[PDB]
Design a protein around this ligand. Structure first.
Ligand SMILES: CCCCCCCCCCCCCCCCCC(=O)OC[C@H](COP(=O)([O-])OCC(O)COP(=O)([O-])OC[C@@H](COC(=O)CCCCCCCCCCCCCCCCC)OC(=O)CCCCCCCCCCCCCCCCC)OC(=O)CCCCCCCCCCCCCCCCC
Ligand SMILES: CCCCCCCCCCCCCCCCCC(=O)OC[C@H](COP(=O)([O-])OCC(O)COP(=O)([O-])OC[C@@H](COC(=O)CCCCCCCCCCCCCCCCC)OC(=O)CCCCCCCCCCCCCCCCC)OC(=O)CCCCCCCCCCCCCCCCC
Ligand SMILES: CCCCCCCCCCCCCCCCCC(=O)OC[C@H](COP(=O)([O-])OCC[N+](C)(C)C)OC(=O)CCCCCCCCCCCCCCCCC
Ligand SMILES: CCCCCCCCCCCCCCCCCC(=O)OC[C@H](COP(=O)([O-])OCC[N+](C)(C)C)OC(=O)CCCCCCCCCCCCCCCCC
Ligand SMILES: CCCCCCCCCCCCCCCCCC(=O)OC[C@H](COP(=O)([O-])OCC[N+](C)(C)C)OC(=O)CCCCCCCCCCCCCCCCC
Ligand SMILES: CCCCCCCCCCCCCCCCCC(=O)OC[C@H](COP(=O)(O)OCCN)OC(=O)CCCCCCCCCCCCCCCCC
Ligand SMILES: CCCCCCCCCCCCCCCCCC(=O)OC[C@H](COP(=O)(O)OCCN)OC(=O)CCCCCCCCCCCCCCCCC
Ligand SMILES: CCCCCCCCCCCCCCCCCC(=O)OC[C@H](COP(=O)(O)OCCN)OC(=O)CCCCCCCCCCCCCCCCC
Ligand SMILES: CCCCCCCCCCCCCCCCCC(=O)OC[C@H](COP(=O)(O)OCCN)OC(=O)CCCCCCCCCCCCCCCCC
Ligand SMILES: Nc1nc2c(ncn2[C@@H]2O[C@H](COP(=O)(O)OP(=O)(O)OP(=O)(O)O)[C@@H](O)[C@H]2O)c(=O)[nH]1
Ligand SMILES: [Mg+2]
Lengths: 120, 49, 99, 347, 459, 320
């Protein structure tokens, strides 16, 4: 639905307007989980090649963690940008079409009638 | 010597080890640098202190 | 003989090699520690201290408070000639009926 | 093949697909398909046997017929709109022809018969290309013309694909035939959601590719192409049986694994459009696929089938196949559900 | 809930990083410590539930189920370590890992705030349960049992997924606290009839409901002992917990949609209780006993009264400890004679005196001797069902007669009479077996002193 | 650089290493024919690598520390038990033959890998091409069932098609009565139980099936017991062969790269020696094979990939 956004800089991973958003924190729990997945991939690499799982090739395990965390950081920046754009579009549309989103005159429960269904 | 034939992984591939560790350091340094500039640019555009 | 398959091993009696076995492990030292952790953390800690902890829960779900509050209201309402309880939960002056 | 020529041919397969994906002109889209078909035939023929020749011939006939129908749709579209832009088609006949042409290229039911046979007749590495990379170009076209696609037609193709894929896989003992019917069934999910939210078509495609790539890679690691030859893995590489188990459960769509995510997100989009019956039918019918995935897990990981004496000789040698990206792929195939909101990067 | 989730997760590295000969000692000790800390969940208030965060909460319904769940893990490790003694180390560690992962999914299942988070974890428990049954079950039938278990559950739970997403689109939220205030009555239309069935059938299959129960005698019988303990003690209660939650948004349609399921349960409990009288497999008899008891929970949940909801909560807890104890008692005989046939080994009271006391206590709780919490739960349900319709006392009364008959028939057949002459390997009961039985029955009888903590939110 | 497509692109091509001396030679003959003595003589004079005949423990000799492994890791295959009880109902006769065929198949791939990688020729004593003579002899004496022969032919059909035959086949012809006399001299109590019927069937297979077939694709040289003693004459004959037949002439760098990729990966070599055909002689139940596999990994240097075993002195494992 958002393919033809008016301000869509096409075929750009992170358009310039994304720089107005706060970056993901390096302590982001989603980034920590991505790092954990990288660490699991490192352990699996040892297992399938019959090296000692925990100790073998610590350099290789480190590059698994770094690359997952590095790619994870940019994917989260785009993720947060795409939801920010969704909200920005939604609120602009609601403002441009007030006749479609009227504030309801909403009553108290003392005034509204709800049927009673006894449980007996 | 135990193995009758010398294993392909008998000794470390010091070239790969060096390029593996250097790559991790580069990405980490680059990532920290990227994050610091994003925070600075986020603060500048939002007029934050 | 059909495939090469091992015959089924005979069932081992833990008491045979260890008449003092507790049934936890074939190693007598590990067997004793397994018994001790189960009995200590199982009975000494969880069941005894847990039972005490449950016995002294601070007014679980407000039942003692409610009794004290009911006594206070009954004393007040009878001392003022008010009904002990009213059929209406909500004041009718706040309710607007249909029609 | 000369390894350099093999590299050039693979790069041409990719170039054909990339041309389809960046083209704004219908002629260049058609050229991309032609280039892709030309380059893939050699990799199917590369082991030189009658079965590989039959599969190459069956594939050529199917794809060439599809490409002629695609060109017919493009020309009809030109006659009624005077332009070539890759976008919604301007004639309902052109739309039907292109939709059928792309269904034939995808192997969707009832244009599916070639997928099981062609996959069975070619090596595992070629089948991996056929069932993953080859879906990218037709999907990228469907992604752009979907506003003009007949709703009943595309949903009919989806329902049939889910039914035929599920039933077809039940009767299979060959691994390549199982993956072919699994591909047909998963195809139906991607097209079923396309009219409502094309982004979820892309999500299902990406996750399907990752899981399918993982399965083929593990089958290649041990050179297994039948159920019974895979049942020896426990007595050679036990870790591989665990990885196979996790991926098969993921492909079955079981929570909390990654393969549940596309089914979960597609059900959500269809229900937002008041489509209740169809997602319920699709979800239930997908239990067929879970059944013949579970059958594989029984013979591979959860029980121990009889071995052979000569298997003892294999214990003394290491795995030397590359298994490229396998540790990463298997993790993505299973442990990605907690990151589901990341699907917005596809928007 | 992170103070329970993280320690549970740490049981895995503890298991994998332990010395080879300390895997059972270490995991048992620390799982008991986790079970001890779960008592902090008993900070319940009269009005408001204990709401930790956006993701998790605990009220008087989930709290007892959580304590039972965490209590069961050390008991299952004790029950398993004998018959896994010849398993190689790595496969032992993977077996323990499946048990830990099941506990992780369960404690998050019982505290999930959002029904779709509840759903994902509710289905998640299938995977470790299926692996335990099919990998470590003993007979050929375990493979078939796994398929019945898997596809009975999913046939019901996939319609539930569609219903839940439909509700979120219509209400805007699946957060359980929000649904308490935004719930709207259900109009009586054909479309709402199938929404009601979608929201309930998955939970009905897990109870199980009579008619939809065929998976249970297969799964509960073919599983290893740890599998049977958790299957009967906790996993059946996911269905009850789910029904107790989701009925909030199904009124008033439950008034008439309950009738077919009440008839299946009221008549089904008498049918399954009768089956117990003629079962030849001891494990199979205990499994059919669970179906009869859970029929009372289904009926209690569907009539939706404060008394039936207190009774249902007590029964779920009471049955959990009792059924797990019976499976462990039956397993201890199986580890000696290697058969599940009930008539094979007789007169075991002569050879195993103390173990015969556990059999008696297990039997008495099963037939609901007062003042056990088994009786308290059953009584409260009978009281509420009498108000629903006086005539129900006939079906409830007949079931209590039949339950006494099969409970004591099991006791008399195995423990009394003359011992079987040719069975000469009935060695004395191990300390482990005796501790395992007493860790079931002692908490069960202690709860009689303070029943309120297992009576649920309506108390 | 480990050999592969990239090494091939960088100029590692077999036509550079190979010369007119890069020949694969097999010496064949009946039991106690002196083939082994000649094979060592040929190899030395021509400067070729000699491979002693692949026995039960050939695979042990190429992996690990190179020492033979206990018998249960060969399935209890026993040549001695084949001579004491060739009709034993435990399936030893065909289980041995299937194991020996896999051993020869492995050795043949080892011979090709040496020849293609280094360019030096090799001398083998019997090969996968002549292994079937023993199978026919077993079958005709009733030591194995016809199902066993079908299994062998199924395995041979999908394995031997991948390789090139020897450049030269040297056959040493010794009549059965002389072979029988020579066995008595060698003084092996179990070998002394071989019957003339069994030895004759070996001879018939060699002359009726093997030599006619290899003649169409190899240079076949035949020698009596007396002629074979003069290795100088035998080596002289090999040096003046023309080499004008056989598939070796249709080979180029591209086709030898594909062959080298195969023979170097020993699991791809042995892939079909364990096809899931449930023949009682070679089928092992899960409980037994599970038990033995666990004991294998408990052997010194066997738990991990070679170079990652601390218990045999591997170092730097945390950086490998
Ligand atoms: C340009 C930018 C760089 C991109 C490079 C493009 C590819 C060219 C290089 C590959 C050829 C080469 O280098 O070696 C030749 C060399 C030829 O010499 P040879 O040994 O004498 O010939 C043997 C046979 O030819 C082959 O040997 P075999 O028969 O025994 O098996 C070979 C097998 C062995 O490879 C393995 O080790 C198993 C793992 C391969 C699958 C993993 C690929 C990634 C899966 C998707 C995830 C994305 C990453 O590799 C293959 O299957 C070839 C196809 C690999 C692509 C599979 C298509 C994946 C779908 C991509 C979807 C992306 C969108 C997702 C949304 O053989 C090889 O080494 C083949 C393996 C190459 C490395 C692994 C595969 C390439 C890396 C993945 C690239 C992913 C991009 C998509 C590719 C699409 C192609 C249609
Ligand atoms: C933007 C860039 C950020 C990402 C950095 C990606 C760098 C990865 C390059 C690793 C590599 O050499 O690939 C070789 C790789 C062969 O290794 P492999 O079969 O993939 O398995 C790993 C081996 O054990 C590894 O075999 P090894 O023993 O030869 O490892 C030594 C290797 C170091 O290689 C490694 O340590 C492999 C582990 C690196 C991580 C694997 C790639 C993961 C990429 C990120 C995936 C994103 C996940 C999605 C995000 C989370 C979900 C949102 O040394 C290097 O080559 C240093 C890289 C120089 C640049 O082939 C290729 O990747 C290209 C074909
Ligand atoms: C050598 C490159 C090979 C790439 C072509 C082969 C793979 C093609 C198939 C990819 C997987 C299936 C489709 C994935 C869709 C995800 C696209 C996306 O969301 O990101 C595109 C984003 C957003 O572009 P967009 O917002 O304009 O729209 C993307 C297209 N749709 C919406 C249809 C999916 O663009 C970029 O990532 C920036 C371009 C960077 C170019 C770098 C290329 C790699 C070289 C370094
Ligand atoms: C006849 C037998 C002997 C009778 C003795 C009567 C006198 C005993 C004294 C007494 O009443 O005790 C005080 C109380 C009852 O009387 P009370 O409520 O008036 O408490 C007295 C203390 N004051 C005055 C401060 C209130 O006993 C208990 O509360 C015992 C509760 C134990 C239940 C919890 C057991 C712990 C289980 C650990 C968890 C693991 C098991 C799994 C659980 C499943 C999920 C819940
Ligand atoms: C000439 C241009 C044609 C494309 C390059 C083909 C030859 C490249 C080469 O020599 O590398 C061989 C290498 C051979 O290595 P390899 O990938 O086949 O395997 C690694 C080597 N072994 C297996 C031995 C360990 O192939 C490549 O990996 C190159 C991949 C990139 C292809 C070029 C991309 C162009 C993008 C536009
Ligand atoms: C969600 C959590 C999922 C995490 C997945 C972790 C990565 C995959 C498993 C890695 C462990 C493995 O593959 O091999 C098992 C390994 C056996 O150890 P070993 O072969 O002797 O190696 C020497 C150890 N230093 O075991 C070890 O000794 C290393 C310790 C790690 C073991 C991890 C156990 C994985 C089981 C996960 C099952 C799913 C959990 C739910
Ligand atoms: C400087 C050299 C260059 C390379 C440096 C790279 C280092 C980082 C790469 C990852 C490696 C982590 C450290 C691994 C330590 C392994 C040491 C080891 O193997 O010894 C085993 C040790 C003790 O075991 P032991 O007592 O000897 O025997 C028990 C028998 N059952 O057992 C242990 O105690 C091991 C404990 C487990 C290992 C730690 C687990 C780390 C988990 C990482 C989570 C990733 C999260 C990423 C999030 C990032 C977000 C920003
Ligand atoms: C998940 C499993 C899928 C497999 C993971 C794939 C990993 C993709 C890697 C993406 C991370 C790239 C980091 C590079 C960042 C960088 O420093 O360079 C920027 C460059 C593009 O720069 P650009 O923004 O276009 O131009 C600036 C002018 N404004 O950067 C680039 O060139 C962009 C790179 C292209 C990325 C394509 C889109 C990635 C999304 C893949 C599918 C994600 C699937 C998510 C599934 C959801 C469920 C979990
Ligand atoms: C053995 C297989 C195990 C699996 C079992 C599966 C059970 C699924 C049951 C699904 C049935 C759901 C009901 C669908 C019918 C439509 C319901 C409806 O909307 O009808 C409304 C009407 C209500 O009546 P009323 O109470 O008078 O209205 C309020 C005024 N007082 O309707 C009524 O009159 C209310 C009464 C409806 C119930 C009828 C009960 C039929 C008799 C009992 C059958 C027990 C179940 C039989 C299962 C056999 C399966 C082979
Ligand atoms: N059953 C069986 N026995 C074999 C096979 N290959 C060798 N043998 C036996 O291994 C033993 C030694 O093999 P030979 O080389 O032929 O005997 P030899 O004494 O060394 O004779 P020369 O080396 O020529 O001097 C013989 O007893 C053979 O029976 C085989 O493929 N099958
Ligand atoms: Mg010899």
């Amino acid at each position: 639905m958002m393919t033809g956004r008016q301000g869509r800089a096409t075929f750009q991973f992170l358009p310039d307007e994304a720089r107005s958003l706060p970056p993901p924190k390096l302590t982001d729990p989603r980034l920590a989980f991505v790092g954990f997945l990288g660490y699991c991939s490192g352990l699996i690499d040892n297992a399938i090649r019959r090296r000692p799982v925990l100790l073998a090739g610590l350099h290789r395990q480190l590059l698994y963690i770094t690359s997952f965390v590095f790619v994870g950081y940019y994917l989260l920046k785009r993720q947060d940008y795409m939801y920010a754009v969704r909200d920005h579009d939604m609120f602009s549309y609601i403002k441009s079409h007030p006749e479609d989103f009227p504030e309801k005159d909403k009553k108290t429960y003392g005034e509204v009638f709800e049927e009673f269904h006894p449980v007996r | 010597k135990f193995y009758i034939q010398e294993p392909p992984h008998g000794s470390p591939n010091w070239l790969k080890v060096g390029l593996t560790l250097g790559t991790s350091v580069f990405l980490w340094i680059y990532l920290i640098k990227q994050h610091n500039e994003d925070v600075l640019e986020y603060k500048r555009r939002n007029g934050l202190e | 003989l059909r495939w090469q398959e091992d015959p089924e091993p005979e069932d081992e009696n833990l008491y045979e090699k260890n008449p003092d076995s507790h049934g936890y492990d074939k190693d007598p030292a590990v067997d004793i520690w397994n018994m001790r952790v189960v009995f200590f953390f199982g009975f000494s800690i969880v069941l005894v201290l847990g039972s005490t902890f449950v016995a002294y829960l601070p007014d679980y779900r407000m039942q003692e408070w409610a009794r004290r509050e009911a006594e206070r209201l009954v004393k007040y309402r009878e001392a003022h000639g008010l009904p002990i309880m009213e059929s209406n939960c909500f004041d009718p002056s706040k309710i607007q009926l249909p029609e | 093949m000369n390894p350099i020529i093999f590299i050039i041919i693979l790069l041409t397969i990719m170039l054909g697909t990339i041309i389809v994906m960046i083209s704004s002109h219908w002629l260049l889209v058609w050229i991309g398909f032609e280039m892709n078909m030309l380059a893939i035939i050699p990799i199917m023929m590369k082991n030189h046997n009658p079965r590989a020749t039959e599969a190459s011939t069956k594939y050529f006939l199917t794809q060439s017929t599809a490409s002629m129908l695609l060109m017919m749709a493009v020309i009809i579209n030109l006659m009624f709109s005077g332009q070539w832009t890759v976008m919604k088609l301007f004639n309902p006949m052109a739309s039907m022809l292109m939709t059928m042409a792309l269904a034939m290229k995808l192997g969707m039911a009832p244009f599916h018969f070639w997928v099981p046979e062609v996959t069975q007749g070619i090596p595992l590495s070629s089948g991996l290309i056929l069932l993953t990379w080859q879906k990218l170009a037709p999907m990228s076209v469907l992604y752009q013309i979907f506003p003009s696609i007949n709703l009943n037609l595309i949903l009919t193709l989806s329902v049939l694909s889910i039914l035929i894929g599920g039933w077809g896989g039940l009767n299979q003992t060959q691994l390549r035939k199982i993956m072919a019917y699994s591909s047909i069934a998963h195809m139906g999910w991607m097209t079923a959601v396309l009219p409502y939210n094309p982004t979820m078509t892309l999500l299902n495609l990406i996750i399907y590719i990752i899981m399918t790539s993982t399965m083929f890679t593990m089958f290649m690691a041990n050179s297994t192409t039948t159920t019974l030859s895979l049942s020896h893995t426990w007595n050679k590489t036990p870790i591989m049986t665990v990885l196979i188990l996790a991926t098969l459960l993921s492909m079955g769509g079981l929570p909390p694994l990654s393969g549940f995510m596309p089914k979960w997100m597609i059900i959500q989009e269809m229900t937002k459009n008041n489509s209740i019956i169809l997602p319920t039918f699709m979800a239930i019918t997908a239990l067929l696929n879970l059944y013949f995935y579970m059958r594989l897990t029984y013979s591979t990981t959860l029980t121990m089938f009889p071995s052979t004496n000569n298997m003892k000789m294999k214990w003394q040698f290491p795995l030397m196949k590359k298994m490229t990206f396998l540790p990463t792929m298997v993790v993505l195939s299973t442990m990605m559900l907690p990151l589901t909101p990341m699907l917005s990067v596809l928007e | 809930m992170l103070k329970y989730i993280i320690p549970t997760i740490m049981l895995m590295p503890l298991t994998w990083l332990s010395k080879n000969n300390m895997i059972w000692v270490n995991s048992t000790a620390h799982s008991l410590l986790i079970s001890f800390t779960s008592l902090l969940l008993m900070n319940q208030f009269g009005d408001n539930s204990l709401n930790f965060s956006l993701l998790f909460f605990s009220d008087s319904l989930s709290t007892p189920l959580l304590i039972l769940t965490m209590w069961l893990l050390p008991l299952m490790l004790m029950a398993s370590q004998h018959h896994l003694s010849k398993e190689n180390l790595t496969r032992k560690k993977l077996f323990i890992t499946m048990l830990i992962s099941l506990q992780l999914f369960l404690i998050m299942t019982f505290t999930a705030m959002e029904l779709i988070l509840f759903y994902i974890l509710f289905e998640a428990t299938l995977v470790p349960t299926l692996i335990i049954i099919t990998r470590w079950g003993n007979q050929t039938e375990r493979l078939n049992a796994g398929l019945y278990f898997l596809f009975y559950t999913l046939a019901g739970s996939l319609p539930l997924l569609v219903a839940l997403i439909y509700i979120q689109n219509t209400v805007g939220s699946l957060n359980f606290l929000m649904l308490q205030y935004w719930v709207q009555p259900v109009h009586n239309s054909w479309s709402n009839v199938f929404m009601w069935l979608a929201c309930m059938m998955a939970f009905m299959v897990k109870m199980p409901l009579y008619g939809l129960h065929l998976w249970l005698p297969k799964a509960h019988v073919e599983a290893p002992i740890a599998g049977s303990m958790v299957l009967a003690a906790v996993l059946l209660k996911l269905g009850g917990y789910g029904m107790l939650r989701i009925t909030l948004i199904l009124n008033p349609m439950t008034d008439f949609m309950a009738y077919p399921f009440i008839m299946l349960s009221l008549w089904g409990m008498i049918m399954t209780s009768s089956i117990c009288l003629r079962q030849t497999d001891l494990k199979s008899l205990i499994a059919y006993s669970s179906v009869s008891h859970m029929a009372l929970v289904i009926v209690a949940i569907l009539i939706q009264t404060p008394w039936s909801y207190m009774g249902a909560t007590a029964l779920m807890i009471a049955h959990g400890l009792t059924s797990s104890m019976l499976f462990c008692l039956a397993n201890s005989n199986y580890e000696r004679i290697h058969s599940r046939t009930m008539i094979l080994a007789r007169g075991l009271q002569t050879l195993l005196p103390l173990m015969a006391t556990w059999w008696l206590l297990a039997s008495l709780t099963n037939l609901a001797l007062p003042p056990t919490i088994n009786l308290i739960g059953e009584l409260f349900v009978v009281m509420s069902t009498f108000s629903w319709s006086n005539i129900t006392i006939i079906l409830m009364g007949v079931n209590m007669v039949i339950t006494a008959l099969y409970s004591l028939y099991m006791l008399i057949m195995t423990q009394r009479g003359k011992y079987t002459y040719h069975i000469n390997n009935i060695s004395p009961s191990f300390t482990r077996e005796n501790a395992l039985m007493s860790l079931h029955i002692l908490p069960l009888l202690l709860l009689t002193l303070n029943p309120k903590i297992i009576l649920g939110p309506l108390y | 650089l480990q050999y592969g497509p990239l090494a091939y692109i960088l100029g590692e091509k077999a036509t550079k290493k190979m010369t007119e001396k890069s020949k694969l030679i097999t010496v064949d003959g009946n039991i106690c024919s002196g083939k082994s003595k000649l094979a060592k003589e040929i190899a030395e004079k021509l400067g070729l690598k000699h491979f002693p005949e692949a026995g039960i423990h050939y695979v042990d000799s190429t992996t690990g520390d190179g020492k033979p492994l206990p018998v249960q890791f060969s399935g209890n295959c026993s040549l001695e038990k084949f001579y004491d009880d060739p009709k034993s109902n435990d399936g030893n006769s065909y289980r041995l033959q299937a194991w020996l065929y896999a051993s020869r198949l492995l050795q043949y791939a080892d011979a090709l890998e040496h020849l293609l990688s280094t360019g030096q020729g090799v001398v083998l004593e019997r090969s996968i091409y002549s292994d079937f003579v023993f199978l026919e002899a077993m079958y005709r004496q009733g030591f194995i069932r016809k199902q066993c022969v079908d299994h062998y032919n199924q395995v041979k059909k999908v394995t031997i098609c991948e390789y090139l035959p020897p450049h030269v086949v040297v056959y040493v012809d010794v009549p059965v009565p002389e072979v029988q006399s020579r066995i008595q001299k060698k003084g092996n109590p179990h070998e002394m139980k071989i019957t003339s019927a069994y030895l004759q069937d070996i001879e018939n297979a060699y002359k009726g099936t093997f030599l006619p077939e290899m003649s169409e694709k190899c240079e076949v040289l035949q020698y009596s017991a007396w002629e074979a003693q003069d290795a100088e004459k035998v080596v002289e004959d090999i040096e003046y062969l023309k080499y004008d037949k056989g598939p070796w002439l249709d080979q180029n760098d591209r086709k030898l790269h594909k062959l080298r990729m195969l023979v170097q990966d020993k699991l791809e070599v042995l892939n079909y020696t364990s096809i899931p055909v449930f023949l009682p002689e070679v089928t092992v139940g899960a409980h037994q094979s599970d038990q033995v596999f666990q004991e294998f990994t408990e052997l010194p240097g066997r738990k991990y990939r070679a170079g990652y075993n601390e218990d045999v002195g591997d170092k730097w494992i945390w950086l490998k």
